[PDB]
């Protein structure tokens, strides 16, 4: 599966009664190398967003 879950989580947030919120991007999507190697998530990007 794809390791990115942000768009799915915002669908769950607005469906349960959420209002205004803040978005902090950490980068854009990387491409799949082939059909059985999804991209990876880096620790240094998420701590830079904090």
């Amino acid at each position: 599966k794809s390791p990115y879950l942000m768009f799915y989580s915002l669908q769950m947030y607005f469906a349960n009664g959420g209002g205004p919120c803040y978005i902090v991007s950490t980068g854009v999507y990387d491409d799949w190398s082939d059909s059985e190697t999804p991209p990876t998530i880096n620790f240094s990007d998420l701590e830079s967003g904090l």
């Binding site: 190398s33 082939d34 190697t37 990876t40």
Partner: protein, 50 residues
């Protein structure tokens, strides 16, 4: 200039003697890791995890 093509076809014959004496070495033997990323992207990403 104009000594390039004289020294090049000498190399083409010199490495031509090496093809019946190699029995075990594959495509990426002796290559830099940065130079295999356009060649085989899925192998390059697997080496980075290890």
């Amino acid at each position: 200039f104009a000594n390039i093509g004289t020294r090049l076809d000498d190399i083409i014959a010199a490495v031509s003697a090496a093809e019946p004496i190699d029995v075990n070495n594959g495509k990426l033997n002796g290559r830099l890791l940065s130079d295999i990323e356009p060649l085989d992207n899925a192998t390059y990403n697997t080496i980075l995890l290890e």
